[PDB]
């Protein structure tokens, strides 16, 4: 029933099902690995909660940005582009559903 979440980063795609937290970050073992030094090892958590996908800033040093606003969380209803590390840091494209 819950839609899957596709994450597009720098020519890569990964697709996740609701039920376990997804890690975005610099860690070699991250589900979505982003190597730029602005990025913390476990920079974001992605998860399906209360009926929607969310991207959560996991107490990162350099943060999560939506349209030049630094935010602790981004709600992903259908489609969304965010930046991590800076307003012009690595971009993540989110897409909900198949």
């Amino acid at each position: 029933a819950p839609p899957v979440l596709t994450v597009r980063y720098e020519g890569s795609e990964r697709t996740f099902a609701a039920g376990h937290d997804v890690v975005v970050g610099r860690d070699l073992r991250a589900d979505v690995r982003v190597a730029h030094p602005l990025i913390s090892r476990a920079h974001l958590l992605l998860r399906f909660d209360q009926g929607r996908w969310v991207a959560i800033d996991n107490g990162s040093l350099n943060g999560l940005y939506l349209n030049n606003r630094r935010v602790p969380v981004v709600d992903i209803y259908d489609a969304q582009r965010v930046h991590i590390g800076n307003p012009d840091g690595p971009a993540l494209d989110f897409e909900v559903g198949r």
Side-chain angles (χ1 to χ4, degrees), residues 1-77:
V4 297
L5 177 72
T6 294
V7 183
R8 196 161 308 106
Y9 164 70
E10 278 308 302
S12 294
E13 271 200 15
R14 295 293 183 280
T15 300
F16 304 99
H20 291 291
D21 295 348
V22 182
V23 178
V24 182
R26 221 183 70 256
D27 199 88
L28 299 180
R29 283 213 100 238
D31 299 290
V32 177
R33 176 205 177 181
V34 178
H36 197 277
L38 284 171
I39 305 312
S40 298
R41 290 183 67 164
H43 195 101
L44 303 183
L45 300 176
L46 316 178
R47 72 196 304 257
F48 189 83
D49 186 48
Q50 297 172 76
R52 74 178 55 158
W53 282 100
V54 292
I56 301 161
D57 186 354
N58 188 37
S60 70
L61 179 63
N62 290 317
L64 167 68
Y65 292 85
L66 176 64
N67 308 318
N68 301 297
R69 185 183 183 179
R70 187 165 173 161
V71 295
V73 63
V74 168
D75 296 295
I76 313 164
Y77 302 93

Side-chain angles (χ1 to χ4, degrees), residues 74-92:
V74 168
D75 296 295
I76 313 164
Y77 302 93
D78 181 67
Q80 193 66 268
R81 168 176 249 145
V82 302
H83 297 264
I84 48 179
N86 256 341
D88 61 344
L92 307 171

